[PDB]
Symmetry: C5
């Protein structure tokens, strides 16, 4: 057992395919997902030719250790995948059809910029390293790339599973390495974020603005500080579900901005009271009357500007 030798001096082509049976645990924080799939491998090995006549059988079945099998590995996994050889078929010419079922935890960065209205392309990268007597090179048999209909990934919509057909070939520590990019295209179901986070967060903000219709300092201070706190809670909640990014995310921004609104609300509440104590309620009155319009208007304007920047 060692690689099949060249008729001319060509590289050995290994045809690959991945067929997804299960998708689970897309973990936003860790940036990983779990996959369970068929991996198929095919390649010519002429040493394996045989006569159906002189051997009885149209196809031969072999056990893994009886024949050379190319060492395909995944790049972006945590551990070597878990693999069960399902079947090895050789047709008389010596074409080998290899089928395994595997499960793995795959590393794959997400772009959180438009969370929770984002989409992602997950990758599974197949690789192979050339041996000394010859160069091995990968290809996609499109016939054998797919996914079953039930493959659901909680909280995500699956758009498509396809491979980039042309391998990236490169040198790595003095041997040739041939790498393939399988892509799984998903988009986040943002639905639930609406009732669970966004609206509650808006409600509490609007409740704060009722301070603009009140001349009670002690009341206002309570309205504004209390809701501020609830906002902090949502902030903390939302940030425990995301990893820490070196860029602002869309929700992140809305969340941050809204602090500014609480801060300016407190100022207004403070100024209004101060003026009142100093015996000038009319200036106060018209600062408050303004705020009733200004706050919602600037809040709306600022949001449109953000949606534009982000989307």
């Amino acid at each position: 057992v060692s690689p099949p030798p060249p008729i001319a001096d060509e590289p050995l082509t290994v045809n690959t395919g991945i067929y997804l049976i299960e998708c689970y645990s897309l973990d936003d924080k860790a940036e990983t997902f779990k996959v369970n799939a068929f991996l198929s491998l095919s390649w010519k090995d002429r040493r394996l030719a045989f006569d159906p006549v002189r051997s009885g059988v149209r196809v031969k079945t072999y056990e893994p250790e009886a024949i050379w099998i190319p060492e395909i590995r995944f790049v972006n996994v945590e551990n070597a995948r878990d693999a069960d050889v399902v079947d090895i078929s050789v047709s008389p010419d010596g074409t080998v059809q290899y089928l395994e079922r595997f499960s793995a935890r795959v590393l794959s960065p997400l772009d959180f910029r438009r969370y929770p209205f984002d989409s992602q392309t997950l990758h599974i990268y197949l690789i192979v390293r050339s041996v000394d007597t010859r160069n091995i090179v990968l290809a996609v048999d499109l016939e054998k790339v797919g996914k079953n209909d039930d493959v659901f990934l909680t909280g995500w919509d699956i758009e498509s599973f396809t491979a980039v057909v042309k391998p990236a070939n490169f040198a790595l520590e003095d041997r040739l390495e041939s790498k393939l990019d399988y892509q799984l295209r998903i988009s986040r179901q943002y639905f639930s974020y609406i009732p669970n986070i966004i609206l509650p967060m808006l409600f509490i903000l609007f409740i704060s603005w009722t301070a603009f219709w009140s001349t009670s300092y002690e009341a206002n201070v309570t309205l504004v500080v209390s809701t501020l706190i609830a906002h902090i809670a949502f902030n903390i909640l939302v940030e425990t579900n995301l990893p820490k990014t070196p860029y602002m995310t869309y929700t992140g921004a809305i969340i941050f901005m809204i602090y500014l609104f609480y801060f300016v609300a407190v100022i207004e509440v403070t100024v209004q009271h101060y003026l009142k104590v100093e015996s000038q309620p009319a200036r106060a009155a018209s600062i408050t009357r303004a705020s009733r319009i200004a706050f919602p208007v600037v809040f709306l304007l600022a949001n449109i500007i953000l949606a534009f920047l982000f989307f």
Copy 2:
């Protein structure tokens, strides 16, 4: 070792059964459960027959590696199942009886629409892929489907464990695949949700409505905002136990609706105060007097409407 060949040209029939020994860890968020069970397999292998009278043994026992065993796999598992072969028996006509004990973690989607008053059908899907010299096909021996009496799944009632007797047969990458649907029917015990979540949540809401019997703005603001905060707490608690769905859930909806009630209460409290400061207590008085009835009534109507839409 390779498949037993056809007398005529029929498929090979593998009879299967699953007998549950343990059920644990129905995890709502992950949408998985753990199972520990007997898997039974039976099929005819004529190469293995013998004389009942001549042999003087009724039956005969082999070690897994000595005979052909069909590769049965689970579709919706995380990893290949953990299996000990318990026993393999071959009788005179060459019928093999195979028995393993296995544990696995099974993926199976839940419908959270009626949570926490919901029911589910868990699935375990057995599958086999045909080989080159013949097609393998699955069937259910009902005699060998079941579950022991103590199988308790915490926080759920077990209704039934049955198999859909007719396999789904289909082609997958150019070979026939035979698949069976075992169903575990369960329903959630909603009991504890009542004292732990629902009632507390109502109590704090009703406490909010005491503001309708109070002319103190500062008091009301404290009543209404305080309880709203406790409501957010229950909301966050509830939503950490569920996964994120693209559809409202029953509890989800009640929770969301109740925000609307707090918001409107705050408005009323604001309006009442405003009119009082503006020297018109009698309009204020009759808005509050209306609210004493309107709030409980519309809360009751809205709930009946919801239970009707959901159930």
Copy 3:
């Protein structure tokens, strides 16, 4: 290797012992615990007998695979136990003494009715399934059931480790199965629940009742609603440590009842205020005067009733 055949036509008796070396991770929520222990098996295999004299040896040693060993399994485990065969001895008349050291995660339901003053019986169930040429049956050699003195199980007191001597024998898929019940009797150390949960929870309740000595609506509302929120916190704390049961638990009931106290307190606070605004302080005064005694008395009466019902 296959089962030793009957002298007459008797079943094969396997004597068993379990000797606990470690107990850890009694997890209330999952209802499981971890064990590490010796498992000892003994049975007669006549094919293995020998003359003491032409051998010059009292005993003989074997490696697992060299002789027939009965397949004992645990019923109520997650996965097949982890086992090291420590030693196998065969004495002249062919009595085999088998000793293994194993660890396993055991499933075992708890009765949370009297938490945290509760006791439990943990079970480890040994089983064996009969083969075709004979019936195997389990027994307990009391000599070899025990636990070492240091076996401590955090937060629990260990009462006793004993086996029910008589197996339950029954049929399961057309073979006889012999099952033994080892029982580990424990009771919860309730001590810490007192200063960590119970008393705090009482202190905040009592603090609430100070509203009965205050004519300040604003003050009272603060007292009552504040402490109610702390109560919710302890409620949430407590319920994250327990699984969800279809029955009320003792702590659960105290917790729930207390909500009723807060609710009625808020009513009283409300009524008192209302009457005062409506210029009748004397009715108010005697409702409050009553409450100072009613609340603590009815609280004490309701608790005695509950302890009675639960204990």
Copy 4:
């Protein structure tokens, strides 16, 4: 392969050492720690002795399965340790030197009485069970007990790693068992508890006592109940990092005591107000004036008593 037989009728002596390479994950709640270490074993096997002059070689090598090796096991682990045999040397007189590198998770109870100013003695117990043809007995080769200089265990100082030289020998199920006690002496770095928990907790308490310089019931009620809540938070935080003990811990006590202070502060705030409403401000005034001194003094005295009881 079976045990080397006695020259006279002596027991076989296995010399042992443990050399720590890594210490991590001292988990207070689980009462476990993880260790990575060399385990060294030495014993005389005469069947293996050879000549140095004629052999030309002065030491001989072996693979594990080629010679008898005593089965040493750890008592207080979760699972059998993970072990790579590093090397096995045999010298001319047939002395074997065995070396393995292992990792394990070790169970070892902690005394939380003085937390977080506490010290602990972790234990790793080695054990061996005698075989039928002779008794095996353990000893410590001090030359081979130690730890590397970088062995750091987060949040703990390492004082010393020594073995108690004399084994405990005892019978267990009719065989002799020899057991050795390796001790790892550590003490907790309490530093960070000071700024993270203790001081904040004192700060909020002191803030509570400002009520004693205030004649505002509403203000006071807010001061006291608010801080009491923050106190509960620190309580809950602290108790999630400890396991539940059947004894008071030092911090636990301070934490519990402090509730008593809040409760009495609330009473005082209540009494003061009551007297004021009832038109007697001078009794009120001198109760408060007393409390300004009493509170801090009794708090200081109570703490000295506790430190004394605990330390």
Copy 5:
């Protein structure tokens, strides 16, 4: 199979390289990180030398078990690494080129002093232990130390991966041990700490200082105590992400200092009110007027001092 013997009496040099394919899970609390990489080993074994001419190949392939391979291990890992041998090549003069792909969890202490503006040096320590017939010694082939371009470690910037070329050699239990230090230089992306923790924390503090423009005790008590509570929440949040250190961290220090601010704020609020009740508003007035400037100024001075001490 055993070590290749010296031409003269030289040590055997093993050349090593590590080439990172993946970095993930830098966990601050556990002080560990996960790595996935090529490890390459090279050394001369003359027994394996061969004539290019007579044998008709310029390279020679072996399976691990067929030749001697030095036992290289990592020092600071949790468990033995997970390794596939990728390839073993022997050239004519008997130079062996070994290549494995491995994954491991590496322990490596972090200096938290400047968190979250900190940088770290992660280490992977390769080691080998000499055998009896000769001394093995490690070196770095710089040709073979590297990392691929996509190696991203979430929330960290990767500066460089280099090896200190000169081994530390030392004796351990009477054998020579040769150890190499591969260093991975990273610095934390502090960006998101700004909007998520730092600014919110400053906002709530500034809100507190509005109390300095308010003569309402009851209001002030609410501002200062509310925000103090929010600060405790940020404190708790921050400290659950960090392990417990025996030194103050930068954030740690800001956070602690800020408590001092709240406490002094409360005192001011208290004194102001006291003086007012005692009929001297003018002292009060000028204490508050001072505080409006003192607080922000001393806050700013104290921060410059801190940055200076820490950076």
